[PDB]
Amino acid sequence: MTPIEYIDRALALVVDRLARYPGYEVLLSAEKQLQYIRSVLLDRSLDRSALHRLTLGSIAVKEFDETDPELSRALKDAYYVGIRTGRGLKVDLP
Numbered sequence: 001m002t003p004i005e006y007i008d009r010a011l012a013l014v015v016d017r018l019a020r021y022p023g024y025e026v027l028l029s030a031e032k033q034l035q036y037i038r039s040v041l042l043d044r045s046l047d048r049s050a051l052h053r054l055t056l057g058s059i060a061v062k063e064f065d066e067t068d069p070e071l072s073r074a075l076k077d078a079y080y081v082g083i084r085t086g087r088g089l090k091v092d093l094p
Contacts, residue, residue, distance in 0.1 A: 003081035003091065004041055007034050011075030017068050026063050030075050032054055035084040051086030054079060 011034055018027050033056040040048045057076035066071040081091050 003085055006035055006040065006081055007078040010034060010078055012072060013070045013074060019069055026059060030060050034078060037078060048086050051082045
């Protein structure tokens with residue numbers, strides 16, 4: 001229904017993994033992203049176009065492919081919806 005939820009979910013899964021690896025460049029790199037997609041989601045004046053420029057998930061799908069699929073799957077979908085919203089496109093997936 002809303003992207004805020006999709007990204008909100010991953011935020012919870014990330015916390016768990018982070019606990020095991022307190023100081024991962026890939027974790028923070030992907031986490032910090034979720035913060036942007038969420039910020040812009042509420043912000044109107046802030047930069048939104050960047051949502052399309054960003055590219056989170058390509059690293060998680062490879063690095064966190066088997067090690068942490070719950071995060072990768074959530075990330076790939078997190079930015080996915082973000083891009084559309086960034087421009088104002090409809091959202092709806094199976």
